[PDB]
Enzyme design. Structure first.
Site, short mmCIF file in Angstrom:
data_model
loop_
_atom_site.label_atom_id
_atom_site.label_comp_id
_atom_site.label_asym_id
_atom_site.label_seq_id
_atom_site.Cartn_x
_atom_site.Cartn_y
_atom_site.Cartn_z
N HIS A 69 11.74 -13.99 -1.42
CA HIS A 69 12.97 -13.22 -1.30
C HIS A 69 14.11 -14.20 -1.59
O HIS A 69 13.86 -15.40 -1.71
CB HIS A 69 13.14 -12.59 0.09
N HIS A 101 16.90 -15.15 0.22
CA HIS A 101 17.65 -15.87 1.22
C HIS A 101 17.77 -17.32 0.75
O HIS A 101 16.88 -17.84 0.08
CB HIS A 101 17.00 -15.74 2.60
N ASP A 133 17.55 -20.33 1.90
CA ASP A 133 16.57 -21.37 2.20
C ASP A 133 15.23 -21.14 1.51
O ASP A 133 14.28 -21.88 1.74
CB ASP A 133 16.39 -21.53 3.72
N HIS A 134 15.16 -20.13 0.65
CA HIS A 134 13.94 -19.89 -0.12
C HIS A 134 14.16 -19.87 -1.63
O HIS A 134 13.21 -19.68 -2.40
CB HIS A 134 13.24 -18.63 0.38
N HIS A 187 12.24 -7.87 6.90
CA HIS A 187 13.10 -9.05 6.96
C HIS A 187 14.08 -9.04 5.79
O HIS A 187 15.26 -9.36 5.95
CB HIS A 187 12.26 -10.33 6.91
N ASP A 190 8.79 -15.37 5.67
CA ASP A 190 9.76 -14.91 6.67
C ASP A 190 9.36 -13.61 7.38
O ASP A 190 10.13 -13.08 8.17
CB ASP A 190 11.16 -14.80 6.07
N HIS A 193 8.60 -21.33 9.61
CA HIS A 193 9.65 -22.08 10.29
C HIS A 193 9.26 -22.40 11.73
O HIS A 193 9.99 -22.07 12.66
CB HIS A 193 10.95 -21.27 10.27
C1 LIG Z 1 18.21 -19.82 8.03
C2 LIG Z 1 18.98 -18.68 7.82
N1 LIG Z 1 20.29 -18.67 8.05
C3 LIG Z 1 21.03 -17.51 7.82
C4 LIG Z 1 20.42 -16.41 7.38
C5 LIG Z 1 19.10 -16.40 7.15
C6 LIG Z 1 18.40 -17.51 7.36
O1 LIG Z 1 17.06 -17.49 7.12
C7 LIG Z 1 18.72 -15.13 6.69
O2 LIG Z 1 19.91 -14.34 6.67
C8 LIG Z 1 20.87 -15.20 7.10
O3 LIG Z 1 22.05 -14.90 7.28
ZN LIG Z 2 14.72 -15.02 4.97
ZN LIG Z 3 13.15 -18.51 5.85
#
Ligand SMILES: Cc1ncc2c(c1O)COC2=O
Ligand SMILES: [Zn+2]
Ligand SMILES: [Zn+2]
Ligand SMILES: Cc1ncc2c(c1O)COC2=O
Ligand SMILES: Cc1ncc2c(c1O)COC2=O
Ligand SMILES: Cc1ncc2c(c1O)COC2=O
Ligand SMILES: [Zn+2]
Ligand SMILES: [Zn+2]
Lengths: 270, 270
Positions: B94, B96, B98-99, B183, B205, B250
């Site tokens: 997805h 987001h 961090d991915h 998610h 996630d 995580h």
């Molecule tokens: C790590 C992290 N920080 C903020 C958000 C998300 C995160 O995984 C997903 O949607 C967010 O606003």
């Molecule tokens: Zn996410």
């Molecule tokens: Zn994540």
């Protein structure tokens, strides 16, 4: 994309008259032995497998082998996070002992050599016995030569059959086995093409050193010295007509400039 | 044969109420972020690409990123003698931040995501803007969100188009993307099968931690919490009906036992 790793396999000692047929000069000369790992879109190809240390110490201790444990085939692959099992195809240029010492570790890989080489190994000229002294690459050849005591447990005829080839052949795209007989009945050299660097022409035993090729002076180990010279001519012209960087099999001073271990040829050019 | 490398991408900080929707408890919690490198007979697949450090420090400094240079995507691949260029396919679970922080380094790879995710990134729910805050993965999404200033030089619409998919799919043999929405609109989890070890079910996630899955307590970041819970049920049953080792996205205490860097899953069993 195609990367080429050189597996450093330590070193051996010959007299200068061995390395330079009749020309020399004499006196001990130490030279490196190595193998060629091609990581290619069609698989991982290993060209030659170095010498087996116990074999040399037993049969050719006068060659005074020096080979550290990272310079066996499994050791050298170890430096790449690889195991013998990760290799899909083992190609042998010929079956002299310093080029097939590590075949025993690849029962699962497909094997390829020249049509005539396994028959040669089973039944060589009387002056070739020493060159073809390690039969652990082939259950069949070991039987014929009465050297089954060399076979590693689990080596059968089934897991050590070769597909015999003949003439110049494409191993894979950009990878040609170049026929270079003389030194041995079915000796092959190797040509590897890349997309952002000039082709590499590995001479293997068709030319031991740069000096060999420069003066058409072949090694004293050969079955046919006329063929041997023609094969040098063929390798010189090949290099010219392509763009090839010539890399030699047993050239200590040139070897020092070769990439081994984690270093490779064929980097991406950003 | 199929090996799986985990690319350690450093860490981030959320409140406990973020990680455990409504349950908590509160207080800062640091968790790891990682990506999944599959070396497979059909190519090198990278699943997710971690977070971009500058992006987080600018937009989410309250998440207090700690990421050393071996924990960027090119850095982590560096530990394997690899470059971003060696990856054939990038899959995003997805978008987001961090991915998909490292997608920018893969213009040449084929990209795959769920059909709905790029549209979501272009135009997310008002409560999703922060999750979808790094648009450098897509020239198109960056335009729509007016964040073209995030685009790395050389990123065009041409080298950042995704092939949209839907439902459960085979990425390659023994490799399934498991649909786990909730998610996010098009969230995928990953199932990897091997030949001499039990399958691995990467939750990404859909389940942040073991504790999440155990209590059906999803993260507080979601678009649809009913879907989110169903996706946990689906992941639990999947793991049971297969033999799968569940690996969580995580989970700091579980992460410590995970193989990263040069260590991999799927060793040959001699
Ligand atoms: C790590 C992290 N920080 C903020 C958000 C998300 C995160 O995984 C997903 O949607 C967010 O606003
Ligand atoms: Zn996410
Ligand atoms: Zn994540
Ligand atoms: C054992 C041995 N012999 C020769 C060389 C090396 C050896 O480890 C490394 O580079 C060499 O030239
Ligand atoms: C290195 C070396 N030593 C002995 C022989 C060969 C060698 O390459 C070839 O034929 C031989 O007898
Ligand atoms: C920066 C950073 N944060 C967390 C971890 C690591 C890190 O380098 C390595 O293993 C971890 O859990
Ligand atoms: Zn030879
Ligand atoms: Zn040789």
């Amino acid at each position: 994309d195609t990367k080429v790793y050189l597996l450093d396999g330590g070193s051996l000692v010959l007299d200068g008259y061995h390395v330079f047929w009749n020309r020399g000069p004499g006196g001990e000369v130490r030279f490196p032995v190595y193998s060629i790992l091609i990581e290619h879109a069609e698989g991982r190809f290993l060209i030659d497998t170095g010498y087996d240390y116990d074999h040399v110490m037993k049969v050719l201790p006068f060659e005074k082998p020096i080979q550290e444990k990272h310079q066996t085939i499994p050791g050298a692959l170890g430096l790449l996070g690889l195991e013998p099992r990760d290799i899909d195809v083992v190609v042998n240029s010929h079956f002299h002992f310093d080029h097939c010492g590590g075949n025993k570790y690849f029962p699962h890989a497909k094997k390829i050599c020249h049509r005539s080489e396994v028959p040669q190994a089973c039944n060589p000229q009387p002056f070739e016995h020493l060159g073809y002294s390690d039969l652990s690459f082939s259950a069949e050849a070991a039987e014929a030569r009465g050297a089954t005591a060399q076979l590693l447990e689990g080596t059968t005829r089934a897991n050590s059959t070769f597909e015999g080839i003949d003439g110049d052949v494409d191993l894979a795209r950009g990878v040609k086995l170049i026929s270079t007989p003389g030194h041995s009945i079915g000796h092959y050299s190797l040509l590897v093409e890349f997309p952002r660097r000039k082709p590499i022409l590995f001479t293997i035993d068709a030319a031991y050193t740069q000096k060999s090729l420069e003066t058409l002076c072949q090694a004293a180990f050969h079955i046919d010295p006329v063929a041997g010279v023609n094969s040098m001519r063929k390798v010189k012209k090949l290099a010219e007509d392509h763009g090839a960087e010539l890399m030699y099999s047993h050239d200590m001073d040139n070897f020092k400039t070769y990439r081994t271990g984690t270093q490779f040829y064929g980097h991406h050019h950003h």
